[PDB]
Design a protein around this ligand. Structure first.
Ligand SMILES: O=C(O)CCC(=O)C(=O)O
Ligand SMILES: O=C(O)CCC(=O)C(=O)O
Ligand SMILES: [Fe+2]
Ligand SMILES: [Fe+2]
Lengths: 341, 6, 341, 6
């Protein structure tokens, strides 16, 4: 019923037509309701953020100076630093935590990282578009102090007054980082959740963001905490295995398409699946990660994200206690078989 | 606690 | 093959015949090997105890002064204190921890406790034998300072030099208690395990003791820790539900029949099912519970009882964390479904 | 610890 989805595409100012159309969105087996698109001055948006519910802010001017960013401009002022760059034979970019790749030997990586100079990525990209290849690239690099003076100028022009104040009103911890993300159309970052508050600032291109609340942990089936893909869903949204993951048939998402100038508040613990529209061109995004507020001095009923916190801790403790993360599953099963199930 | 993240 | 069981019944001194015969033992679906019966001076027995494996000591003189105990003698020197007495319409005496009876409302007790004077129990017993009723009684009362002078004399005559030294050589903690157990023939105390070291001193009658090592946790299915029957098996040995408890088909026990003068070492965490032989007459036993040695400063591989310790703690912590022990199961299932199973 | 009883 109320599964509108992203809603009717927005009309770009100056009768320039629809910014995008449904045919650029991929097809999924689950329904979704729309994420509210509001003005930062709108009281509702502040209520949504405080209550940790997603919202799309349209007029923050958060990264106004970056709206002009494009491959050329960047490959001219970003510097000569090294930029992490992932690759993939498919559109899906599953992330792997390398420090955990030891716990699992029978794990075969699908997207390899590769440091390089911006001009190399831009070239490798152009080269990829040359022979009309199928390979896909996704540059994801934290912004360090090694960036050109211009980029630094642009950075200073971000609306710090607005975000810092947001950080203040929510009691959040410190900004841990700003990841710069440049990706090819069709690219997909599979559903996953974070332990930090996220302000996702779109700059170039359009991105479809599908979010699931913490209480859908049961339908999303995250990998084991000690596994490299910790925090990611094991469910393949394109070919879901309902035998292994029955409750994915019950998953209900919240979606929206963000474009140049939109800022999406992705609350801590909320799953998010993000895809760059098909034939939409490269996309550029800069996000802002903040440690969440501290843990209260607790109150029941417990919130969904708190139970997720508990489960993660249990898995961690058992891994240390048993001296081997591989024993976690067999111990958990022994504990519940014929006792709690 | 146990209800804490990281 | 080597499933001898208790072995051929022992021959009582003075050609008084077999102390008991197989027909007094109940029938079970699992095999068993015999628990070794040795002399306290036998080096092997000391090795078994140190390695925490069960053993039957035949000549400790642990409770020599009590070998003369019988209903009359006791109902003449035990005192006027109160003695806990359980009842049951069946031969099975499942135990219920009352402090936990609040966590589960949908729990209907099967054996009710009832304080009374020794002479009342002896009378109630005689009365029960009068009308040839079916009710069964099992007196289980800790020995306090309110016992007659004679019983106190007898108590002092126990071989403290032997047991105290055992306590010394094993690094055990302190003797927590001595439970006096008087029961009717056919009575059964269902399989369960303890967190303390146990010296089970038989005094009158014969008892069949079936033990299972800690590593058979998977086949015995203990009730949830917060449940009243914590530490007991949910499996009904007389009519085992293989659908709910599949690995009970894999259970392998160690058994033996103890009689007047035998002392059975039931190591901490070892499951024990204890039954008074059918038509064997009332039985009397006094046990000795000691806190185990302290926890080392750990080493892998981990021992079976250590994993049991871990699982109990996990269940306890989650019960507190969630603020309701009833949420433990649903949380554990959410954690493993489609992730660790 | 966690490997402790009670
Ligand atoms: O935009 C993407 O592709 C990934 C971004 C993401 O997961 C985030 O910013 O939290
Ligand atoms: O002998 C019985 O019936 C119960 C005794 C028991 O479980 C023990 O002494 O540990
Ligand atoms: Fe993310
Ligand atoms: Fe016991």
């Amino acid at each position: 019923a109320v599964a509108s989805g992203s809603g009717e595409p927005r009309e770009e100012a100056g009768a320039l037509g629809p910014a995008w159309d449904e045919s650029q969105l991929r097809s999924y087996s689950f329904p979704t309701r729309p994420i509210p698109r509001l003005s930062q001055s709108d009281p509702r948006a502040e209520e949504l953020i405080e209550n940790e519910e997603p919202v799309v802010l349209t007029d923050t001017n958060l990264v106004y100076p970056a709206l002009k960013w494009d491959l050329e401009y960047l490959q001219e002022n970003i510097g000569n630093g090294d930029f992490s760059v992932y690759s993939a034979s498919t559109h899906k970019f599953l992330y792997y935590d390398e420090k955990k790749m030891a716990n699992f030997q029978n794990f075969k990586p699908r997207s390899n990282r590769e440091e390089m100079k911006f001009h190399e990525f831009v070239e490798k990209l152009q080269d990829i578009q040359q022979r009309g290849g199928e390979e896909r690239l996704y540059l994801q690099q934290t912004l360090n102090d090694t960036v050109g003076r211009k980029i630094v100028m642009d950075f200073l022009g971000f609306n710090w007054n607005w975000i810092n104040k947001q950080q203040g009103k929510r009691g959040w911890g410190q900004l841990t980082s700003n990841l710069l993300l440049i990706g090819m159309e069709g690219n997909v970052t599979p559903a996953h959740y974070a332990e930090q508050q996220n302000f996702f600032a779109q700059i170039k291109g359009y991105k479809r963001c599908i979010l699931f609340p913490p209480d859908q942990f049961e339908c999303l089936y995250p990998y084991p905490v000690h596994h490299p893909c910790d925090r990611q869903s094991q469910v393949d949204f394109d070919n879901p295995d309902y035998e292994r993951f029955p409750n994915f048939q019950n998953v209900v998402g919240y979606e929206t398409v963000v474009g140049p100038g939109d800022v999406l508040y992705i609350p801590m613990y909320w799953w998010h699946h993000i895809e760059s529209l098909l034939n939409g061109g490269i996309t550029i995004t800069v996000n802002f990660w903040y440690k969440g507020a501290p843990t209260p001095k607790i109150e029941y009923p417990l919130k969904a994200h708190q139970k997720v916190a508990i489960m993660r801790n249990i898995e961690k403790m058992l891994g240390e206690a048993l001296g081997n993360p591989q024993e976690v599953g067999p111990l958990l099963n022994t504990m519940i078989k014929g006792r709690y199930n | 606690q146990l209800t804490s993240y990281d």
